[PDB]
Amino acid sequence: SHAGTTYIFSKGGGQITYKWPPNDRPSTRADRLAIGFSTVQKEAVLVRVDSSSGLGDYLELHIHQGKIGVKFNVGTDDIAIEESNAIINDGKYHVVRFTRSGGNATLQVDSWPVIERYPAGRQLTIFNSQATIIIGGKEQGQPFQGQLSGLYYNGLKVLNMAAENDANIAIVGNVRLV
Amino acid sequence: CPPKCRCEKLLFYCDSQGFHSVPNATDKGSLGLSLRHNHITELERDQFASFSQLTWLHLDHNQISTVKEDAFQGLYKLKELILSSNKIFYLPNTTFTQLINLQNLDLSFNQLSSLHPELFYGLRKLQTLHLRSNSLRTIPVRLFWDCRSLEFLDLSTNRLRSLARNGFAGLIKLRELHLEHNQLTKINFAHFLRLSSLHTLFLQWNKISNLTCGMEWTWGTLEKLDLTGNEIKAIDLTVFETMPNLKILLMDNNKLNSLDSKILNSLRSLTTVGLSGNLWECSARICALASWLGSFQGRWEHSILCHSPDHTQGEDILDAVAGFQLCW
Ligand SMILES: *[C@@H]1O[C@H](CO[C@@H]2O[C@@H](C)[C@@H](O)[C@@H](O)[C@@H]2O)[C@@H](O[C@@H]2O[C@H](CO)[C@@H](O)[C@H](O)[C@H]2NC(C)=O)[C@H](O)[C@H]1NC(C)=O
Ligand SMILES: *[C@@H]1O[C@H](CO)[C@@H](O)[C@H](O)[C@H]1NC(C)=O
Ligand SMILES: *[C@@H]1O[C@H](CO)[C@@H](O)[C@H](O)[C@H]1NC(C)=O
Ligand SMILES: *[C@@H]1O[C@H](CO)[C@@H](O)[C@H](O)[C@H]1NC(C)=O
Ligand SMILES: [Ca+2]
Ligand SMILES: [Zn+2]
């Protein structure tokens, strides 16, 4: 049960990217990422938000050993959170939700216990000047193979925007809008 | 009682009627007169000669453009005069001098460009003076020489370019001074030396670049200083030595880059501070500020955020200090 705007990432790799205007690259104290997907892969990179040139800040959503997880960096250090209780590469539809509040993070697989992770001490709270959203994980050398639907990032329905041929969007590789 | 006017007592309420001049009065023993929101365009000589016993007179929101000499003559008992929201641009030097018992004078929202150096002479019982929202560019050195009991002065929303050395002579009892929304460039706090009773000073939304203090002195009564929304980038290391009892200091939305520990060591009586929106450089330089915050026991309404270098932008100072190993 998977309906919504969806893209097929088949063999050979694929990539959907969004380019923010140079001046308006946003900074955020909190982040809300929700993606609908289905896959059978053991290892892949779904979405990655990279900061503008000259900044180490980043946010990456990926599958590793069939387990969905998130890794992010405010500036100083890498923070990781993963659903290790179970597996999501069974080929069925899932919605994973990621939530960031400064150093804090939240992961929840569809209809499973919510994962909450709180860093010790005081952390940097700002993800700094986001430049691109790279859906596909081709450039990371782990292209994703499957179906992606209803991607949500900070109020942006990015896939829906790609299906509307938004000028900024750049579609490359073997990706089809079924 | 004169036509179109309802009178509750000796008080005459003639607001919101089409009056182009002051009506002649059957009863000349009136205590108060209200002529608000009419279309009076001119004030004649001895116009209120009939209303000798007037204590308050409201002439706000009229198109008054010309005020003849001796316009208010004979109003010895008048203690409140409201002339705001008009088109007054020139005032004869003798226009207020007769009104001795005046306590509240409002000349705000007018087109005054300059004031006669002897305009406010002999207003010793004056307590409040509203000159807000005028186009004054300069202010006579002797204007407030006779204003002995003035304790509230409003000069906000004008076109004041800079402050005279001793313009304030005779404001020895002034408590609250409004200078916001003008066009000041620099502040030499020695210029306020004569205001020895001031508790609050508003200087926000000017174009202030520098904070200096030419003469060493102690301004023991000043408790609140609002400098919000200027362009302050530099501050002499002794300007806050002057204000030992300063308890509220607001410096948001400026171009402050850092603060010397010499500065911050004088600001210890503070209960409220404001340092947001500044161009803070997040490096070892802010340690003076960072340490102070740990030491500080007062309040600050808004969070203080780094502006430089870029990787620290928008992040609270202390979070960035401890996060990037900037100090200690
Ligand atoms: C990130 O989370 C921290 C800590 O989360 C707390 O721990 C959990 C057990 C749960 O009880 C959470 O609700 C707690 O908030 C937050 O730091 C706490 O913030 C609250 C509210 O501001 C405060 O009452 C606590 O004292 C704080 N604890 C510490 C150790 O500082 C922090 O606010 C979160 N950051 C962001 C950006 O949301
Ligand atoms: C009103 O007063 C003026 C003088 O100010 C006088 O010339 C005029 O006759 C008066 N009119 C009435 C009706 O009293
Ligand atoms: C009024 O102004 C004139 C300027 O022409 C000045 O010489 C005179 O002294 C002033 N009178 C008073 C009483 O201030
Ligand atoms: C303010 O001080 C700075 C350096 O302290 C100086 O360069 C500048 O000229 C001063 N501003 C004015 C208006 O004198
Ligand atoms: Ca950052
Ligand atoms: Zn009219």
XYZ file of C-alpha atoms and ligand atoms in Angstrom:
588
model
C 0.000 0.000 0.000
C 2.239 2.669 -1.443
C 0.271 5.336 -3.361
C 1.631 8.882 -3.645
C 4.064 10.497 -6.086
C 6.763 7.867 -6.626
C 10.048 7.391 -8.524
C 11.577 4.106 -9.719
C 15.304 3.788 -9.075
C 16.369 0.781 -11.144
C 19.733 -0.814 -11.946
C 22.545 1.506 -13.023
C 21.854 4.096 -10.343
C 19.767 7.258 -10.280
C 19.616 10.689 -8.689
C 17.120 13.470 -7.984
C 18.624 16.779 -6.869
C 17.274 20.135 -5.741
C 19.295 23.344 -5.902
C 18.446 26.183 -3.516
C 18.897 29.760 -4.734
C 22.403 30.955 -3.731
C 21.144 33.654 -1.354
C 18.325 31.673 0.313
C 20.232 28.559 1.429
C 18.433 28.014 4.743
C 19.836 27.492 8.224
C 17.794 25.458 10.705
C 17.832 24.723 14.442
C 15.467 21.799 13.850
C 14.825 19.394 10.963
C 11.887 17.189 9.922
C 12.520 14.460 7.344
C 9.947 11.890 6.240
C 10.313 9.536 3.283
C 8.203 6.713 1.922
C 10.178 3.885 0.367
C 10.351 0.228 -0.596
C 13.514 -1.772 -1.301
C 15.327 -5.101 -1.014
C 18.887 -3.734 -0.944
C 21.376 -4.566 1.813
C 23.315 -1.277 1.479
C 22.283 2.099 0.009
C 22.031 5.868 0.481
C 18.536 7.341 0.095
C 18.795 11.066 0.812
C 21.640 13.399 1.738
C 21.470 17.108 2.499
C 24.812 18.828 2.050
C 25.816 22.285 3.187
C 27.073 25.009 0.898
C 30.688 25.016 -0.254
C 33.062 25.473 2.679
C 30.898 23.807 5.325
C 31.036 20.348 6.885
C 27.426 20.347 8.087
C 25.429 17.473 6.554
C 22.465 15.110 6.949
C 22.400 11.578 5.487
C 19.665 8.934 5.437
C 20.902 5.459 4.524
C 20.427 1.707 4.782
C 23.241 -0.428 6.198
C 22.816 -4.192 6.609
C 19.114 -3.787 5.849
C 18.707 -1.442 8.817
C 17.546 2.139 8.194
C 19.511 4.887 9.945
C 20.554 8.538 9.991
C 23.941 10.257 10.375
C 24.317 14.042 10.677
C 26.834 16.777 11.522
C 26.065 20.266 12.899
C 29.656 21.349 12.309
C 31.925 19.708 14.883
C 31.030 16.018 15.185
C 29.088 13.163 13.580
C 25.899 11.932 15.244
C 24.372 8.572 14.362
C 20.967 6.994 14.975
C 19.686 3.694 13.563
C 16.772 1.265 13.814
C 18.635 -1.865 14.915
C 15.690 -3.821 16.341
C 14.519 -4.978 12.920
C 14.889 -4.883 9.128
C 13.297 -2.717 6.406
C 14.613 -4.224 3.150
C 11.785 -6.773 2.789
C 10.492 -4.975 -0.306
C 7.332 -3.619 1.307
C 6.423 0.049 1.759
C 7.752 1.843 4.818
C 7.757 5.399 6.082
C 10.741 6.408 8.176
C 10.643 9.717 10.044
C 13.703 11.627 11.179
C 13.637 14.539 13.595
C 16.481 16.799 14.689
C 16.452 19.341 17.485
C 19.971 20.699 17.740
C 21.980 17.743 18.977
C 18.925 15.577 19.569
C 17.568 13.141 17.027
C 14.510 10.977 16.495
C 13.930 8.029 14.203
C 10.730 6.102 13.747
C 10.043 3.282 11.351
C 6.446 3.046 10.204
C 4.215 1.795 13.032
C 7.110 0.609 15.224
C 8.396 1.912 18.575
C 9.889 5.399 18.199
C 13.657 5.767 18.571
C 14.871 8.744 20.551
C 18.498 9.662 20.925
C 19.866 12.465 23.090
C 23.522 13.564 22.926
C 25.395 14.239 26.177
C 26.250 17.786 27.226
C 25.569 20.828 25.069
C 25.814 20.478 21.298
C 25.834 22.790 18.323
C 22.247 23.466 17.319
C 22.501 24.743 13.759
C 22.625 22.965 10.430
C 24.350 25.588 8.409
C 23.351 26.966 4.962
C 21.858 23.933 3.161
C 22.762 23.921 -0.538
C 21.455 20.685 -2.057
C 19.207 17.697 -1.497
C 20.594 14.620 -3.267
C 18.079 11.791 -3.569
C 19.587 8.560 -4.876
C 22.984 8.258 -3.241
C 24.793 7.760 -6.532
C 27.553 10.263 -5.742
C 28.184 8.442 -2.452
C 28.958 5.242 -4.357
C 25.906 3.473 -2.947
C 23.037 4.148 -5.387
C 19.569 3.164 -4.196
C 17.338 0.673 -6.015
C 13.587 0.715 -5.395
C 10.657 3.118 -5.046
C 10.503 6.446 -3.178
C 7.290 8.275 -2.290
C 6.083 11.303 -0.337
C 9.495 12.679 0.600
C 9.183 15.512 3.112
C 11.977 17.845 4.224
C 11.232 20.955 6.301
C 7.919 21.695 4.590
C 9.193 20.712 1.161
C 7.563 17.905 -0.791
C 10.644 17.441 -2.963
C 9.501 14.480 -5.076
C 6.154 16.161 -5.723
C 8.156 19.194 -6.824
C 10.166 17.013 -9.204
C 6.937 15.684 -10.696
C 6.010 19.310 -11.345
C 9.195 19.977 -13.337
C 10.424 22.682 -10.952
C 13.168 24.690 -12.669
C 15.750 24.041 -9.940
C 15.271 20.250 -10.005
C 17.844 18.220 -11.936
C 16.853 14.686 -12.942
C 19.744 12.425 -13.975
C 20.302 8.684 -14.424
C 17.849 5.806 -14.658
C 14.873 7.290 -12.793
C 11.232 7.067 -13.888
C 8.162 8.875 -12.524
C 5.568 6.079 -12.483
C -23.223 77.679 26.468
C -21.996 78.351 22.886
C -23.616 76.540 19.891
C -22.682 73.010 18.725
C -20.916 72.529 22.059
C -21.941 70.321 24.970
C -20.803 71.479 28.411
C -20.568 69.000 31.298
C -19.527 71.757 33.710
C -17.400 74.858 33.309
C -15.564 72.409 31.079
C -16.449 72.892 27.401
C -16.289 69.864 25.099
C -16.360 71.018 21.478
C -14.677 68.036 19.802
C -15.496 66.842 16.273
C -17.506 69.787 14.992
C -16.744 71.919 11.965
C -15.122 74.837 13.760
C -12.729 76.985 11.754
C -12.080 79.279 14.703
C -12.614 79.529 18.454
C -16.269 80.273 19.263
C -17.166 83.321 21.355
C -18.507 82.216 24.743
C -21.612 83.305 26.660
C -19.904 82.069 29.820
C -16.345 83.359 30.152
C -15.618 81.569 33.425
C -14.822 78.241 31.772
C -12.147 76.035 33.349
C -11.367 73.779 30.396
C -11.772 73.822 26.621
C -11.626 71.009 24.072
C -11.479 71.779 20.335
C -10.271 68.453 18.994
C -10.700 67.260 15.401
C -12.153 70.480 14.022
C -10.617 72.376 11.100
C -9.083 75.397 12.786
C -6.390 76.874 10.573
C -5.430 80.005 12.487
C -5.025 81.238 16.067
C -5.757 84.957 16.476
C -4.311 87.426 18.963
C -6.086 87.236 22.336
C -8.317 84.465 20.966
C -8.827 82.969 24.417
C -9.073 86.358 26.122
C -12.608 85.393 27.136
C -11.486 82.083 28.650
C -9.188 83.651 31.266
C -9.870 80.949 33.863
C -8.818 78.124 31.522
C -6.679 75.440 33.204
C -6.436 73.018 30.282
C -6.833 73.651 26.556
C -6.918 70.915 23.898
C -6.258 72.002 20.306
C -5.001 68.706 18.870
C -5.764 67.434 15.354
C -6.517 70.810 13.795
C -4.979 72.204 10.596
C -3.429 75.106 12.548
C -0.626 76.627 10.479
C -0.210 80.181 11.763
C -0.080 81.270 15.398
C -0.149 85.025 15.929
C 1.901 86.681 18.646
C 0.077 86.915 21.994
C -2.244 84.107 20.883
C -2.595 82.633 24.378
C -2.402 85.921 26.275
C -4.123 86.164 29.646
C -4.127 82.406 30.265
C -2.254 82.710 33.557
C -4.045 79.732 35.107
C -3.449 77.388 32.140
C -1.413 74.313 33.115
C -2.010 71.976 30.149
C -1.755 72.944 26.475
C -2.086 70.322 23.748
C -1.114 71.471 20.259
C -0.204 68.138 18.684
C -1.212 66.847 15.236
C -1.299 70.226 13.484
C 0.652 72.022 10.763
C 2.508 74.491 12.998
C 5.955 75.397 11.672
C 6.726 78.794 13.201
C 6.234 80.045 16.748
C 6.771 83.684 17.811
C 9.267 83.868 20.670
C 6.744 85.424 23.033
C 4.063 82.821 22.403
C 4.448 80.767 25.612
C 6.286 83.173 27.923
C 3.096 84.581 29.475
C 1.725 81.116 30.320
C 3.506 80.770 33.661
C 1.606 77.912 35.350
C 2.018 75.614 32.353
C 2.805 72.033 33.393
C 2.208 69.972 30.264
C 2.971 71.274 26.787
C 2.492 69.115 23.702
C 3.848 70.238 20.344
C 4.280 66.789 18.815
C 3.305 65.788 15.264
C 3.916 69.245 13.816
C 6.100 70.765 11.116
C 8.548 72.616 13.370
C 11.985 72.950 11.795
C 13.584 75.198 14.403
C 12.845 76.785 17.785
C 13.479 80.279 19.105
C 16.201 80.119 21.825
C 13.855 81.977 24.203
C 10.665 80.083 23.311
C 10.427 78.185 26.590
C 11.775 80.943 28.814
C 9.812 81.342 32.043
C 8.138 77.926 32.107
C 9.442 76.976 35.546
C 6.371 74.918 36.453
C 6.653 72.816 33.283
C 6.914 69.089 34.003
C 6.423 67.423 30.612
C 7.357 68.566 27.098
C 6.411 66.584 23.988
C 8.240 67.567 20.806
C 7.942 64.149 19.180
C 7.646 63.756 15.424
C 8.890 67.129 14.223
C 11.547 68.058 11.675
C 13.943 69.836 14.050
C 17.533 69.623 12.807
C 19.227 71.489 15.637
C 18.456 72.624 19.177
C 19.414 75.969 20.815
C 21.936 75.782 23.649
C 19.817 77.940 25.944
C 16.373 76.548 25.172
C 15.894 74.695 28.451
C 17.656 77.236 30.653
C 14.460 78.122 32.538
C 12.911 74.633 32.557
C 13.786 73.969 36.192
C 11.065 71.452 37.053
C 10.924 69.618 33.722
C 11.245 65.867 34.277
C 10.050 64.448 30.942
C 11.387 65.540 27.554
C 10.447 63.915 24.241
C 12.554 64.740 21.178
C 12.034 61.468 19.342
C 11.353 61.136 15.599
C 13.136 64.310 14.482
C 16.122 65.167 12.295
C 18.734 65.939 14.965
C 22.178 65.604 13.406
C 24.204 65.900 16.634
C 24.246 67.095 20.252
C 25.497 70.460 21.526
C 28.012 70.416 24.394
C 25.845 72.159 26.957
C 22.446 72.380 25.298
C 20.768 70.797 28.320
C 21.583 73.512 30.873
C 18.727 73.884 33.350
C 17.286 70.384 33.115
C 18.636 69.539 36.549
C 15.457 67.690 37.498
C 14.881 65.889 34.179
C 14.304 62.158 34.744
C 13.415 60.653 31.357
C 14.822 61.723 27.980
C 13.643 60.511 24.571
C 16.043 60.959 21.652
C 15.130 57.870 19.634
C 14.558 57.799 15.868
C 16.769 60.771 15.113
C 19.942 60.913 13.051
C 22.730 60.986 15.631
C 26.147 59.719 14.533
C 28.237 59.618 17.693
C 27.570 59.819 21.429
C 29.855 61.678 23.813
C 28.296 61.025 27.207
C 30.044 64.104 28.606
C 27.344 66.008 26.684
C 24.739 64.790 29.182
C 26.745 66.038 32.166
C 24.099 68.578 33.145
C 21.294 66.004 33.418
C 22.029 64.873 36.959
C 18.626 63.393 37.763
C 18.163 61.255 34.652
C 17.116 57.644 35.263
C 16.268 56.607 31.694
C 17.808 57.560 28.343
C 16.393 56.391 24.993
C 18.764 56.625 22.023
C 17.552 53.748 19.861
C 17.245 53.772 16.062
C 19.768 56.503 15.300
C 22.954 56.086 13.252
C 25.345 55.872 16.200
C 28.788 54.506 15.339
C 30.849 55.540 18.356
C 30.513 55.566 22.135
C 33.010 57.888 23.817
C 33.286 59.844 27.071
C 35.483 62.936 26.943
C 35.215 64.092 30.541
C 35.541 61.611 33.398
C 32.489 61.748 35.676
C 29.923 59.747 37.625
C 26.336 59.574 36.412
C 24.976 57.958 39.549
C 21.280 58.221 38.701
C 21.203 56.670 35.228
C 19.622 53.216 35.405
C 18.404 52.412 31.886
C 20.128 52.972 28.545
C 18.471 51.919 25.290
C 20.800 51.904 22.279
C 18.884 49.345 20.193
C 19.171 49.375 16.411
C 22.136 51.659 15.859
C 25.444 50.985 14.091
C 27.687 50.770 17.136
C 31.028 49.142 16.334
C 33.312 50.919 18.808
C 33.088 51.741 22.529
C 35.624 53.655 24.638
C 36.753 51.562 27.610
C 35.434 54.038 30.184
C 31.930 54.948 28.997
C 30.367 52.492 31.443
C 32.636 53.487 34.308
C 30.437 56.581 34.178
C 27.217 54.711 34.935
C 27.847 52.540 38.036
C 24.142 52.099 38.747
C 23.156 51.244 35.184
C 20.785 48.303 35.494
C 19.263 47.994 32.021
C 21.480 48.160 28.931
C 20.065 47.341 25.501
C 22.411 47.081 22.530
C 20.556 44.782 20.136
C 20.719 45.134 16.361
C 24.061 46.913 16.264
C 27.359 46.051 14.614
C 29.240 45.122 17.779
C 32.081 42.744 17.036
C 33.228 41.776 20.526
C 33.598 43.278 23.998
C 36.748 44.078 25.955
C 36.908 42.635 29.455
C 37.602 46.213 30.587
C 34.125 47.169 29.365
C 32.317 44.174 30.851
C 33.928 44.612 34.271
C 32.052 47.905 34.658
C 28.703 46.359 33.724
C 28.142 44.383 36.926
C 25.068 46.129 38.339
C 23.092 45.069 35.291
C 19.831 43.183 35.776
C 18.882 43.126 32.104
C 21.089 43.120 29.017
C 20.532 42.827 25.269
C 23.237 41.674 22.879
C 21.296 39.954 20.095
C 21.601 40.677 16.377
C 25.163 41.928 16.652
C 28.036 40.952 14.369
C 29.781 38.804 16.988
C 33.057 37.147 15.989
C 33.049 33.690 17.569
C 36.682 33.050 18.471
C 38.931 33.425 21.531
C 38.035 37.126 21.524
C 34.540 36.481 22.950
C 35.891 34.691 26.042
C 35.468 37.921 27.999
C 31.800 37.891 27.023
C 31.399 34.119 27.359
C 32.902 34.031 30.853
C 30.782 37.019 31.874
C 27.613 35.163 30.905
C 28.582 32.237 33.127
C 29.313 34.724 35.901
C 26.275 36.929 35.133
C 23.221 36.740 37.412
C 20.848 39.016 35.526
C 18.457 38.377 32.657
C 18.520 38.654 28.875
C 15.305 38.366 26.865
C 16.747 37.052 23.596
C 19.445 34.477 22.855
C 22.862 35.751 21.793
C 24.106 34.239 18.534
C 27.436 34.087 16.737
C 27.794 35.795 13.353
C 31.405 34.941 12.456
C 33.082 32.796 11.293
C 30.419 31.271 9.053
C 30.407 27.749 10.536
C 29.344 29.201 13.904
C 26.566 31.420 12.537
C 23.276 31.474 14.434
C 24.577 29.313 17.259
C 24.424 30.517 20.860
C 27.770 31.839 22.049
C 28.215 29.410 24.938
C 27.147 26.474 22.758
C 29.741 27.544 20.183
C 32.414 28.257 22.800
C 32.164 24.805 24.370
C 31.472 23.141 21.018
C 34.540 24.511 19.232
C 37.027 24.551 22.141
C 37.508 28.307 21.767
C 38.567 29.101 25.339
C 40.453 27.755 28.372
C 17.684 18.235 23.299
O 17.261 17.398 24.346
C 17.789 17.853 25.596
C 17.588 16.752 26.615
O 16.369 16.039 26.456
C 15.854 15.797 27.790
O 15.959 14.395 28.152
C 14.858 13.453 27.923
C 15.011 12.396 29.008
C 13.448 14.065 27.925
O 12.973 14.261 29.254
C 13.442 15.376 27.177
O 12.106 15.864 27.215
C 14.399 16.344 27.844
O 14.281 17.628 27.235
C 17.110 19.165 25.947
O 17.690 19.641 27.153
C 16.641 19.723 28.126
O 15.663 20.691 27.752
C 14.571 20.774 28.676
C 13.602 21.785 28.108
O 14.289 22.881 27.515
C 15.082 21.157 30.067
O 14.001 21.108 30.993
C 16.197 20.222 30.522
O 16.773 20.715 31.725
C 17.273 20.122 29.446
N 18.312 19.180 29.835
C 19.616 19.411 29.641
C 20.550 18.330 30.094
O 20.025 20.449 29.126
C 17.338 20.195 24.845
O 16.488 21.319 25.061
C 17.052 19.622 23.455
N 17.554 20.524 22.426
C 16.792 21.041 21.456
C 17.489 21.957 20.491
O 15.596 20.785 21.362
C -16.868 87.519 18.532
O -15.637 88.154 18.944
C -15.113 89.091 17.986
C -13.813 89.615 18.549
O -12.884 88.564 18.777
C -16.128 90.200 17.720
O -15.623 91.072 16.714
C -17.453 89.601 17.272
O -18.431 90.626 17.133
C -17.937 88.584 18.296
N -19.194 87.990 17.874
C -20.148 87.625 18.736
C -21.386 87.032 18.136
O -20.013 87.759 19.948
C 11.640 88.267 20.457
O 12.428 88.194 19.247
C 13.239 89.329 18.922
C 13.898 89.020 17.599
O 13.485 89.927 16.587
C 14.236 89.542 20.043
O 15.099 90.630 19.733
C 13.460 89.826 21.316
O 14.367 90.021 22.396
C 12.537 88.656 21.655
N 11.730 88.976 22.822
C 11.596 88.157 23.868
C 10.730 88.655 24.985
O 12.145 87.061 23.911
C 34.621 56.373 15.423
O 35.810 55.709 15.860
C 36.481 55.037 14.787
C 37.600 54.226 15.397
O 37.565 54.267 16.817
C 36.967 56.068 13.778
O 37.603 55.394 12.698
C 35.793 56.892 13.263
O 36.272 57.948 12.439
C 34.984 57.475 14.424
N 33.783 58.130 13.926
C 33.644 59.457 13.845
C 32.334 59.948 13.303
O 34.532 60.227 14.195
Ca 26.359 24.380 10.969
Zn -14.450 72.780 7.713
